[PDB]
Curated annotation (Swiss-Prot):
Keywords: Disulfide bond, Endonuclease, Glycation, Glycoprotein, Hydrolase, Lyase, Nuclease, Secreted, Signal. This is Ribonuclease pancreatic. It is found in: Secreted. Substrate binds at residues 7, 10, 41-45, 66, 85.
């Protein structure tokens, strides 16, 4: 099945663009990554950086995860992110997102060997 590592790239990485360039980024991106296959994913964040730079977060600042888990990491640096929030007009299968671009610190959950990002926790 797809790995938690691969899932994360699919759901959260967007190295092809430096920022969202239009209000439709989210609608376009949530669809083509398959996040709207079974239901409207209510919220999702895309990171507009190198895979390598996101993977490095696993050896940055250790912080507790919002759920109390202790395998979270916070980026020393701010990163180009795209926030996607479902809209009041959202109706499955026509999922609708509000697109919000920001530069923030990203907090991820890391697991395995190689020890990499498996979960996007929050942006701070």
């Amino acid at each position: 099945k797809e790995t938690a590592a691969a899932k994360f790239e699919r759901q959260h990485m967007d190295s092809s663009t430096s920022a969202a360039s239009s209000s439709n980024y989210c609608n376009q991106m949530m669809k083509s990554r398959n996040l709207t296959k079974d239901r409207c994913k209510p919220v999702n964040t895309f990171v507009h950086e190198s895979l390598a730079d996101v993977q490095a977060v696993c050896s940055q600042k250790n912080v507790a995860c919002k759920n109390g888990q202790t395998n979270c990491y916070q980026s020393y640096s701010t990163m180009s992110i795209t926030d996607c929030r479902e809209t009041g007009s959202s109706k499955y299968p026509n999922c609708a997102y509000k697109t919000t671009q920001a530069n923030k610190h990203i907090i991820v959950a890391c697991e395995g060997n190689p020890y990499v990002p498996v979960h996007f926790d929050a942006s701070v």
